[PDB]
Amino acid sequence: ALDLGSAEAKAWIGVENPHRADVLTELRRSTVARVCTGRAGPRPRTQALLRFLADHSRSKDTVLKEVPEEWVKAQGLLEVRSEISDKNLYLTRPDMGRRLCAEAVEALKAQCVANPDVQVVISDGLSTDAITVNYEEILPPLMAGLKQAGLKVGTPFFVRYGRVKIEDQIGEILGAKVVILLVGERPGLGQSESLSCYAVYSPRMATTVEADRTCISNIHQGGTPPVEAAAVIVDLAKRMLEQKASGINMTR
Amino acid sequence: MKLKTTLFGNVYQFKDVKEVLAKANELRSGDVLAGVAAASSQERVAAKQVLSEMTVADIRNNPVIAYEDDCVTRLIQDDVNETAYNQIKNWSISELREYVLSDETSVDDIAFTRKGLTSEVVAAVAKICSNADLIYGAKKMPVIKKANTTIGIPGTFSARLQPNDTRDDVQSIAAQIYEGLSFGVGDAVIGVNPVTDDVENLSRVLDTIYGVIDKFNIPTQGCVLAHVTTQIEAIRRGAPGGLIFQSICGSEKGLKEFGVELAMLDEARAVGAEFNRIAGENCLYFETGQGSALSAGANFGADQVTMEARNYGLARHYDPFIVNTVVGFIGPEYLYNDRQIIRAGLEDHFMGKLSGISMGCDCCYTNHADADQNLNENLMILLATAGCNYIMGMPLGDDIMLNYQTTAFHDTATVRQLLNLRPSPEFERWLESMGIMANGRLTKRAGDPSLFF
Amino acid sequence: MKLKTTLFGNVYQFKDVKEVLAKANELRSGDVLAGVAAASSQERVAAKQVLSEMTVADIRNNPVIAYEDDCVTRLIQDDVNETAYNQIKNWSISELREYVLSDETSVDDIAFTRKGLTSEVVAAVAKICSNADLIYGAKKMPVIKKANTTIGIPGTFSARLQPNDTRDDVQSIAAQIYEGLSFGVGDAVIGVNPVTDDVENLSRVLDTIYGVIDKFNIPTQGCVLAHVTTQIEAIRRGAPGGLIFQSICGSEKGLKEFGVELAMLDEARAVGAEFNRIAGENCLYFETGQGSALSAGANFGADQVTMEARNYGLARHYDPFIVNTVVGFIGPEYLYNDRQIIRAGLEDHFMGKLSGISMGCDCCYTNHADADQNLNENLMILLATAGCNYIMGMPLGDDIMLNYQTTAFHDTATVRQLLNLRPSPEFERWLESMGIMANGRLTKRAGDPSLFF
Amino acid sequence: MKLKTTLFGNVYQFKDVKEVLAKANELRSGDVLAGVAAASSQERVAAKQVLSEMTVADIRNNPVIAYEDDCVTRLIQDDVNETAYNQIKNWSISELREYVLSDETSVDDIAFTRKGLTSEVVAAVAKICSNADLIYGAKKMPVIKKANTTIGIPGTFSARLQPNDTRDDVQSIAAQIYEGLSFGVGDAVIGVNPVTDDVENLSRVLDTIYGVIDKFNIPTQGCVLAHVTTQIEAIRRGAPGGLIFQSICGSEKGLKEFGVELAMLDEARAVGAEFNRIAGENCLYFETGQGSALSAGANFGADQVTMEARNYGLARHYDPFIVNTVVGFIGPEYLYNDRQIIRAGLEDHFMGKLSGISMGCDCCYTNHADADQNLNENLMILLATAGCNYIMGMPLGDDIMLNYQTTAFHDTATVRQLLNLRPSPEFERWLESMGIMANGRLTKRAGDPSLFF
Ligand code: B12
Ligand SMILES: C[C@H]1O[C@@H](n2cnc3c(N)ncnc32)[C@H](O)[C@@H]1O
Ligand SMILES: C[C@H]1O[C@@H](n2cnc3c(N)ncnc32)[C@H](O)[C@@H]1O
Ligand SMILES: C[C@H]1O[C@@H](n2cnc3c(N)ncnc32)[C@H](O)[C@@H]1O
């Protein structure tokens, strides 16, 4: 009897007549990649394929799930959205996900700290789980660390149906010297928790190119710990302010 | 040139070459999103007919981004052999299609003819090809390159070992490498998409790859797919150089989005010649894929197949060891489902082989596209019959840090044994000495990474 | 046997073997229409796992229709080799899948193991196979039969010449025959679906086919795909007998809908032996295809894959020269789109080869299905790599009287030249002597029906 | 590094690397003329031993002309792969010799190792090789290039058809072409040394060559061995471009004597890519030969072998289709007799192959040298066994306007039939279709230029 979502299923070694079976377990705990499941001729073994399919069915589900509005309120976050009205349209209209709606532009001018040094934006992007799971761990150390021995911190807010280039528009509206976007990545097969940070210095919709952003990817318990991440983000914003540059424009 | 035709008694009129190129495409979500797609099957067919009746000169003289505005247009236009162009300039695209597919057209005939093309012409041919046309046409245009392995010889099939980790953990990377080699994967390259884009970490990942290469005397090359400038810097500081990689896009503005100047690719070639551990003459690696220019706001109203062909025209200038489309890497907004991803993979491979580059394909999809692993298995077999130069390999195709599914190490062994194809001959020799392969087949003790211990 | 499993902590409970078989299928419109499909991707995976854990005996002893009620069930069950059954009866379906795929399992290992199977067990294995499993597994299970040509030898690829006409006009039929032959099509059979089902018209059509066969001494066989009764009477009355055809269904009720008794197929065999112009030992021809039983209201709550596999268990008793599924012949209500049509084709071929029958595929679609000709070209190449014994051929694939699109004569020549496959060896010799083929390739003068005049 | 050794108890002291290189040479008139030769057999052997004990670095860092003073030195030095250099920099020239000759050194081992070399190091290895070392070492270092024919494949042997005339009379040129083709000569190039160096005459001669090429669709390429500038202008003005030729010398001063700048050769490459009728990637053609630099007063006290090796270091930068030494083209003042001409030919070929260039040899002599036609026949067979890429061909070897004797058309047919070698595969197919060759051998009707009429 076996649950394909169980940890026992994930650790299963399927190599038959191995050369050194102890090495196999050593290799198995070295990585989250699906190593050491063996083979049937050149095809995957039955259990390996079943666990793949199981994980896919779960992965697909994470794509359409939305963070409830009540979650964002219980975090004290202002919510605006892009021009996107729903999750299905979100998947097909990246051009609209990169643009704030007309009400979002006004809500930001009305309720957000003007001309901050560092402006923090949160968005579901392609993965709700990457926010709901990591949020409490990364966001307070980040907001606190920017204050401590710090500077003018903008009002953090949540953007529904957001794409990365929408941070250029937020920067222009707010006069932010540095804009920090925490966003969910497209979900992987085995987990949907991976969050990344895209940060840019003094963006301008007209001229900023994508290489002008610095990316910090794979923030989650299996990648860079969310607490640990906030600290590298703080330092990065310090350097962007020092250097007046972001992405490929920073020294080193 | 005609920009109209009558179909079932109705006139189908088009505004310019760029629109005919766009509406001729098989339907895909990206062309709809770009606003350039045909309104209906009828208008698509009418566009194909108008396109089939245009000449090579019609399309060569109408690049989708003007020469004086785009260094990629200039690079493509300036590399034309004008003697080969003059011989074909009055051929209709319909005649060029039939010439490529003819069994009376030899590999050497195409070698000269393709030098008279520009990427827009290459795209034009692909647009009026059925799926079997794209497969058969590509199969009769082999492209062979050599680094420390030879890739592209008809009857062979290579694979990139792609051992990625969420933290660039060198133990996770090694673990995937041993597993991949044990299935015969890695004759194209052992190439890592790094998480941290910094010199010391690239060296660590390169040192890890080359520790395995050096320990078992493997004929192959390593690569870390960071930005090309950080690769150059790491190699100049002593990291082991194998292939030097860069993502490319089909317009100057798209290259700026990536932070790439053409001078950097010139620099990568010179750095490879001064530093890189490569026996053969080819050491660059590019990756491409439909939708990148549209994503960058850099398609200038052209469709994604024409833009992707311009990638191959850019690549050809630098004579790389390998190029591959990353066919469904991005999402449903550019290629929605199975049908569209297969069609684009066949197109991409066909255009890359017609442009004379060493064309492989990362057969892949994402979890927000309407696709599943059976699609990867469908496409990898079709492209293999097309003579695709290599695919990727990961454990069961699950990438734990790029969050998409590619092909398994299993899939390369399956393709090779299904179709009686061999690895690169130098790598096959190595697999034989390791006891992993005999007569193109995995031995009983293969597929077991602990064999290396 | 368990009918339950826990998946991500949730219990999925299944009612009987029949429900498990059904829900384990990849999604297809027919199963939804039949009300037998998984409710979720999760439930579909739970069904596969439950199914993978059942034993050969569990499924052998739970046929979807009871022995006492169904002569097809009895025929399937009575034909089992009980010694081969007893060796594998306690294997899980998971273990049987891995056995079929293993490179240490030889063709002769499977030759004996398959005699211990029943059709429901064959279906079970297919349900837990990915697309590449279905292709690789089928490839390593060749089935070779012989009429006047030999079909199924690995490295060969045959084709039915399908010269149909809306009036059975013998001139239109003859013209399509010369065109087909000129592309190397016809080593499987020259087989005509007649408009009129009468002895005089069948004889007229048969006389037409054999007039061409006899004039150029073609090693092949003709057939008119009328009801088996009118074929038998035409041949008894002196029409030339080649292959004897019948459409089959996987249940007694389904056979009745078609007006077929098993006694007619015993008669076909006896009539073939007395009259038919066949050098080898195989002379029967059957066609199958998913959804047939459900269309007759004769699936008894079983899914269309299990009902299709029971066709092959029936077919195997009569050891036919050829069987093919007509994969998308009916419409979108049973298989909706490319995805489902490719999947069904791979399933049908694999299950046919696992059952030991000479399995081919009519790669086709209808105009009311979400399919196009690029789909047929995808599937025919996939199935060729699986060692599909034959496909159909019509001029460009357009059937002018059955109102559907199959594969073109071009497609067989494409497949053969792409994959370095040859025709049936007897027919290849005739094409060589006709000047149509040299070294597996069409000569310059091939493709021209006027070459026969 | 030592510049001294004791031989039979006597101390031989040498002044610099340059003197060691020179005195280690086998005796030849040019070195005596240059005042650089060993005074005794004993001193010559002491020089070889001193030389054998120096390291790669010792010689890499002491080029016979300084980087700051000579653009050929800079080109040679700037092209080194420093990673490959660093691996071998501490090998002795003795150890490098044994490495090249070893059967455990593969073609791909040498492919990388040679990128760490400079020309002076290449020369050093040759100086401590016996004649059979030079033949065996060169044989195991094949260099393959492709224009419209492929040259250099082991088991093949190509030939330049040299149809020269004292008035550039197109009828005399054409007659020699038909004769050459009739013996299977011309797969390297149909190349004419013109009497007059003017655009109209070059175009006339080129039109003549390409008239024959185009009439019989010959897979080959033409060339007129004028100064590279007039070739470039003729082609820019519309003359058919095949190979672009230039005579080279191993020093900046030597290039000036010839009126060549390196920028012209970069221009030749660019003009070739825009205009020339070449299917493959290689289109340049260079000629070299011992004594050239000393004749220009541009050897700077270096010996003629080291100066010849620097030609190949220059040639390699431009990756030509073919290079050949013109081994005894000049006269007895540089190479006196058979002994010296054979030795020089073996040296030149070996150094060329070690440098990675497509190396052939004009086996020739002058009438004021102590040589005869039996010498050319000795050397061409020796060099064929070394895998020499090509030789020349003239009717019986008599050049009526260059006033020297090369190899006959007969000699290429002799070499091929003696050693079971074939022509360039593309050209061999054309000779087969012309009825001139069957199984590598001249048919009965070959050798007869009237066969083309
Ligand atoms: C999809 C993707 C791409 C796509 C983006 C196109 C698109 N429309 O989605 C393509 C194929 C173009 C791409 C290109 C590159 N990518 Co990328 N990419 C990813 C991936 C797999 C997912 C990103 C995601 O889900 N974003 C979330 C969604 C909601 O955002 P979006 O608005 O739809 O998409 C935007 C971002 O994806 C952004 N983006 C994508 N990649 C990169 C890389 C950098 C440096 C930046 C600043 C932005 C960026 O571009 C999109 C358009 O604005 C990540 C890995 C991961 N697990 O996150 C790598 C990743 C972000 N890419 C990476 C790299 C290195 C690159 C390249 C620089 C490669 C190269 N050698 O040139 C290029 C160029 C980037 C640029 N300056 O434009 C690295 C970043 C490393 C780092 N810390 O700097 C990552 C982490 C993967 C990796 N380790 O290789 N990439
Ligand atoms: C993001 C990573 O995936 C590769 N990649 C994926 N899709 C594309 C595309 N359409 N164009 C270029 N590169 C791509 C990049 O080159 C980088 O390595
Ligand atoms: C109707 C014609 O097509 C064949 N045919 C097409 N589809 C199927 C199917 N699903 N089952 C059985 N026979 C079929 C019939 O046997 C007859 O030849
Ligand atoms: C004079 C003609 O012969 C060739 N040629 C003959 N001998 C030599 C040599 N030693 N060096 C260079 N070129 C030579 C020239 O390049 C020209 O073709």
Centre of ligand 2 to C-alpha B319, Å, is 19
CATH number of residue A147's parent domain: 3.40.50.11240
**E strand segments, C183-318:** 189-192, 222-224, 244-247, 284-288
8 A C-beta contact, residue C206 and residue C222: yes
Q: Do B259 and A248 touch (CB under 8 A)?
A: yes
In a mutational test of the pocket of ligand 3, which residue from C195, C202, C247, C394 has the highest number of ligand atoms less than 8 Å from its CB?
C247
Centre of ligand 1 to C-alpha B258, Å, is 10
Query: Among positive and negative, which fits the CA dihedral B32, B36, B42, B44?
Result: negative
Residues 6+ apart with CB under 8 A from B151: B144, B145, B158, B187, B188, B321, B322, B358, B389, B390, B424
Please tell me if the CB atom of residue B246 comes closer than 6 angstroms to any atom of ligand 1: yes
User: What single string gives the DSSP state of each residue in B151-215?
Assistant: E--TTB-EEEE----TT--HHHHHHHHHHHHHTT--SSEEEE--SS--HHHHHHHHHHHHHHHHH
My answer on whether A6 and A84 are in the same domain is no
**Chain D residues close to B241, C-beta within 8 Å:** 83
How many angstroms separate the Cα of D328 from the Cα of each of D292, D300, D355?
11, 22, 21
> Which residues are C57's β-sheet partners?
none
Least CB–CB distance from C136: residue in A5, A42, A54: A42
Q: HEC string of chain D?
A: CCCEEEECCEEEECCCHHHHHHHCCCCCHHHHHHCCCCCCHHHHHHHHHHHHHCEHHHHHCCCCCCHHHCHHHHHHHHCCCHHHHHHHCCCEHHHHHHHHHCCCCCHHHHHHHHHHCCHHHHHHHHHCCCHHHHHHHHHCCCCCEECCCEECCCCECEEEECCCCCCCCHHHHHHHHHHHHHCCCCCCEEEECCCCCCHHHHHHHHHHHHHHHHHHCCCCCEEECCCHHHHHHHHHCCCCCCCEEEECCCCHHHHHHCCCCHHHHHHHHHHHHHHCCCCCCCCEEEEECCCHHHHCCCCCCCCHHHHHHHHHHHHHHCCCCEEEEECCCCCCCCCCEHHHHHHHHHHHHHHHHHCCCCEEEECCECCCCECCHHHHHHHHHHHHHCCCCEEEEEHHHEECCCCEECCEHHHHHHHHHHHCCECCHHHHHHHHHCCCEECCEECCCCCCHHHHC
Q: Does B277 touch chain D (CB under 8 A)?
A: yes
> Which residues are C92's β-sheet partners?
C55
Structure tokens belonging to residue D136 = 């065996």
Tell me the residue range of the domain where A36 lies. 1-67
D156 — phi, psi (to 5°)? -120, 165
> Which residues are C286's β-sheet partners?
C246, C323
Q: What does the alpha-carbon distance between residue D150 and residue D292 come to, in Å, rounded to a whole number?
A: 29
Least CB–CB distance from A42: residue in B336, B414, B453: B414
Centre of ligand 2 to C-alpha A151, Å, is 37
Q: Do D277 and B426 touch (CB under 8 A)?
A: no
Q: What does the alpha-carbon distance between residue B184 and residue B415 come to, in Å, rounded to a whole number?
A: 12
| Chains in contact with B, where contact requires at least 3 CB pairs less than 8 Å apart | A, C, D
Structure tokens belonging to residue D25 = 């040479």
CA angle D11, D12, D18 (to 5 degrees): 155
> Which residues are C325's β-sheet partners?
C288, C361
Q: What does the alpha-carbon distance between residue B350 and residue B359 come to, in Å, rounded to a whole number?
A: 8
Residue in A closest to C48 by C-alpha: A50
**Chain B residues close to C444, C-beta within 8 Å:** 104
Query: To the nearest whole angstrom, how far is the Cα of D115 from the nearest Cα of chain B?
Result: 9
Give the end of a domain, one of A52, A67, A82: A67
Ligand nearest to C-alpha C30 = 3
Residues 6+ apart with CB under 8 A from D191: D160, D161, D162, D222, D223, D224, D225, D243, D245, D285
User: How many helices (DSSP H) and strands (DSSP E) are in chain A?
Assistant: 10, 6
The superfamily (CATH) of domain D1-54 is ethanolamine ammonia-lyase heavy chain domain like (2.30.170.30)
Residue D368's CB is within 10 A of a number of other CB atoms, namely 12
Cα first-last separation, chain B = 67
Residue in C closest to A58 by C-alpha: C42
My answer on whether A81 and A202 are in the same domain is yes
My answer on whether A209 and A176 are in the same domain is yes
> Which residues are B245's β-sheet partners?
B285
> Which residues are D6's β-sheet partners?
D11
**Chain C residues close to A63, C-beta within 8 Å:** none
8 A C-beta contact, residue D63 and residue D120: yes
* Burial call C102-112: b when 16+ CB within 10 Å, e when fewer: bbebeeeebee
State which H helix or E strand residue C390 sits in. Answer: strand C390-393
Query: To the nearest whole angstrom, how far is the Cα of D372 from the nearest Cα of chain B?
Result: 41
Query: Among positive and negative, which fits the CA dihedral C424, C425, C426, C428?
Result: positive
**Chain A residues close to B227, C-beta within 8 Å:** 248
Topology of the domain comprising D142-453: TIM Barrel (3.20.20)
Q: What does the alpha-carbon distance between residue A64 and residue A84 come to, in Å, rounded to a whole number?
A: 14
Residue C39's CB is within 10 A of a number of other CB atoms, namely 9
Identity of the amino acid at C220 = T
8 A C-beta contact, residue A33 and residue B172: yes
Q: Do B419 and C419 touch (CB under 8 A)?
A: yes
How many angstroms separate the Cα of C362 from the Cα of each of B353, C376, C383, C389, D427?
31, 9, 10, 11, 45
Q: How many separate domains does chain A show?
A: 2
B442 — phi, psi (to 5°)? -65, 130
Provide the residue ranges of all domains of chain C, joining segments of one domain with +: 1-54, 55-141, 142-453
Q: Which residues line ligand 4 (CB under 6 A)?
A: D 193, 225, 247, 287-289, 291-292, 326, 329-330
User: What single string gives the DSSP state of each residue in A56-120?
Assistant: HHHHHHHHH----HHHHHHTT-EEEEBS--SHHHHHH-HHHHTSB-HHHHHHHHHHS-SS-SEEE
For residue D388, the Cα-to-chain-centroid distance in whole angstroms is 9
Helical segments of C285-408, H only: 292-295, 304-317, 338-354, 373-385
My answer on whether A139 and A108 are in the same domain is yes
**Chain B residues close to C130, C-beta within 8 Å:** 373-374, 377
Give the residue among C331, C362, C320 at the shortest CA–CA distance from C144: C320
Q: Do B395 and A95 touch (CB under 8 A)?
A: no
| Chains in contact with A, where contact requires at least 3 CB pairs less than 8 Å apart | B, C
Q: What does the alpha-carbon distance between residue B291 and residue B287 come to, in Å, rounded to a whole number?
A: 13
Least CB–CB distance from B82: residue in D82, D275, D279: D275
Is C401 among the annotated ligand-binding positions? yes
Structure tokens belonging to residue C93 = 């379906």
8 A C-beta contact, residue B73 and residue B262: no
* Burial call C127-148: b when 16+ CB within 10 Å, e when fewer: bbbbbbbbbbbbbbbbbebbbb
> What SS3 state is found at A22?
helix
Query: To the nearest whole angstrom, how far is the Cα of C419 from the nearest Cα of chain B?
Result: 7
CATH number of residue A56's parent domain: 1.10.30.40
For residue C342, the Cα-to-chain-centroid distance in whole angstroms is 14
**Chain B residues close to A82, C-beta within 8 Å:** none
Centre of ligand 2 to C-alpha B247, Å, is 6
Q: Which atom of ligand 2 is nearest to the CA of B248?
A: 12
**Chain C residues close to A191, C-beta within 8 Å:** none
User: How many helices (DSSP H) and strands (DSSP E) are in chain B?
Assistant: 21, 16
8 A C-beta contact, residue A99 and residue A82: yes
Token pair 């833009």 is found at: B307
**E strand segments, chain A:** 78-81, 118-125, 157-160, 178-184, 195-201, 213-219
Q: Do B445 and A186 touch (CB under 8 A)?
A: no
Q: Which residues line ligand 2 (CB under 6 A)?
A: B 193, 225, 247, 287-289, 291-292, 326, 329-330
CA angle D83, D86, D92 (to 5 degrees): 140
Please tell me if the CB atom of residue A217 comes closer than 6 angstroms to any atom of ligand 1: yes
Query: Among positive and negative, which fits the CA dihedral B25, B31, B34, B39?
Result: positive
For residue C364, the Cα-to-chain-centroid distance in whole angstroms is 13
8 A C-beta contact, residue A129 and residue A192: yes
8 A C-beta contact, residue A52 and residue B398: yes
Give the residue among C376, C418, C337, C342 at the shortest CA–CA distance from C134: C342
Identity of the amino acid at D285 = Y
Q: What does the alpha-carbon distance between residue A191 and residue D184 come to, in Å, rounded to a whole number?
A: 68
Query: To the nearest whole angstrom, how far is the Cα of A111 from the nearest Cα of chain B?
Result: 31
> What SS3 state is found at B288?
strand
CA dihedral B99, B103, B104, B110 (to 10 degrees): 50
Give the residue among D84, D81, D91, D101 at the shortest CA–CA distance from D59: D91
Q: Which atom of ligand 1 is nearest to the CA of A198?
A: 47
> Which residues are D246's β-sheet partners?
D286
How many angstroms separate the Cα of C390 from the Cα of each of A214, C206, C285, C387, D345?
56, 22, 12, 9, 62
Least CB–CB distance from B81: residue in D80, D108, D273: D273
Structure tokens belonging to residue C98 = 């891995």
Least CB–CB distance from C48: residue in A5, A42, A53: A53
* Mutation site for A-interface testing, chosen from B28, B177, B181, B367 by largest number of A Cβ within 10 Å: B367
Strands B437-438, B441-442: parallel, antiparallel or unpaired by DSSP?
antiparallel
Strands D158-161, D390-393: parallel, antiparallel or unpaired by DSSP?
parallel
Identity of the amino acid at D82 = E
My answer on whether A91 and A20 are in the same domain is no
Q: What does the alpha-carbon distance between residue C160 and residue C141 come to, in Å, rounded to a whole number?
A: 21
State which H helix or E strand residue A24 sits in. Answer: helix A21-30
Centre of ligand 4 to C-alpha D391, Å, is 14
User: What single string gives the DSSP state of each residue in C399-436?
Assistant: ETTTTEE--BHHHHHHHHHHHT-B--HHHHHHHHHTTS
Q: What does the alpha-carbon distance between residue B140 and residue C218 come to, in Å, rounded to a whole number?
A: 31
Q: What does the alpha-carbon distance between residue D222 and residue D240 come to, in Å, rounded to a whole number?
A: 8
Give the residue among D255, D184, D191, D179 at the shortest CA–CA distance from D226: D191
- Give domain B55-141's CATH architecture: Orthogonal Bundle (1.10)
Q: What does the alpha-carbon distance between residue D334 and residue D383 come to, in Å, rounded to a whole number?
A: 20
CA angle A50, B335, B127 (to 5 degrees): 125
